Amino acid sequence: STGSATTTPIDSLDDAYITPVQIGTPAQTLNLDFDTGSSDLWVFSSETTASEVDGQTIYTPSKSTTAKLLSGATWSISYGDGSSSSGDVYTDTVSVGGLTVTGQAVESAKKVSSSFTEDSTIDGLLGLAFSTLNTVSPTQQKTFFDNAKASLDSPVFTADLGYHAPGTYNFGFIDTTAYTGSITYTAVSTKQGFWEWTSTGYAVGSGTFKSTSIDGIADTGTTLLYLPATVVSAYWAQVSGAKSSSSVGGYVFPCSATLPSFTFGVGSARIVIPGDYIDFGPISTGSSSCFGGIQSSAGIGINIFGDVALKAAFVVFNGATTPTLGFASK
């Protein structure tokens, strides 16, 4: 089997992407944030505290003939941005882009943090990291991908995120028309439950390439590119007037600036992030201070190749027995 679904930015900054997902019978379609940095499929639901629901589409298990309470199971998750959610669990039929999993754990939110309430466009998350990170207790549950894997034509999914435009998540096949040149594959460590890999270095603009190992995660659920402070300082030093602002929470730059590109290494290959991708616009409406798309990972504890980086590439998440990641230009 295969599946193919379009993923669409939630706003004009590409702050996140939503992909329609069919849950239950008859189908209830919710727009979920596909997140390769976590492993829970959770949704706003008829059980979510009413004061914490603001415009989201909810899953109502009592209206699904295939829903079954997973008796005794609860979940609770916190994300790197400090947001959180928790609740109980149903199993139900879940389809993405024509690919169907029966008996998928659908984690129904009883509580969500303010950041989720305030974002009307995201109806929940669909985790695509390794199932060892799943938070369901006392019986850990598998991700949608893990459940689908044995049925897939090939045990892979791909992320093809757009810059200020829709893109695609494919399951079970590699679309050879979706990228240019060749895909370069690189080793993955699953020891922390993430799609963790080592970049071979970086360049700033037309500068020379610095060969240096940068361990990080491929994370579709993180907006920006978070890298070591040394790397980030070298980037922003090439932008007149850029500075790290403690008040704002990272690097800002004059909105009148032209940003250089940023290149990262994948083996001997190179992925170029155009300067425009690094512009996240005024820090507040009307400001002439703009927020940078490359920020320091210092104090996160891990480097994160988030959407800023991933949207510059066609990315293969290879879930074979020995997992790997592939990157191609596009």
CA distance 175 to 31: 23
CA distance 67 to 316: 32
CA 39 remoteness from chain centre: 11
Cα angle at 214 between 210 and 216, to 5 degrees?
145
With CA atoms as reference, report the closest residue to 162 among 19, 32, 3.
19
For CA atoms 51, 54, 59, 63, the dihedral sign is positive
DSSP states of 227-265: E-HHHHHHHHTTSTT-EEETTTTEEEEETT--PPPEEEE
Q: Method used for this model?
A: X-ray
Full set of structural domains in the chain with CATH = 5-174 (2.40.70.10), 175-330 (2.40.70.10)
Which residues, in sequence order, are bridge partners of residue 35? 127
Which residues are annotated as catalytic?
Answer: 35, 199
Q: Are 260 and 239 in contact (CB under 8 A)?
A: yes
Non-local (6+) Cβ contacts of 307 within 8 A are: 14, 16, 17, 161, 220, 222, 223, 224
Non-local (6+) Cβ contacts of 263 within 8 A are: 202, 203, 204, 209, 270, 271, 272, 273
Q: Tell me if the bond preceding 138 is cis, omega within 30° of 0.
A: yes
Q: Are 225 and 304 in contact (CB under 8 A)?
A: yes
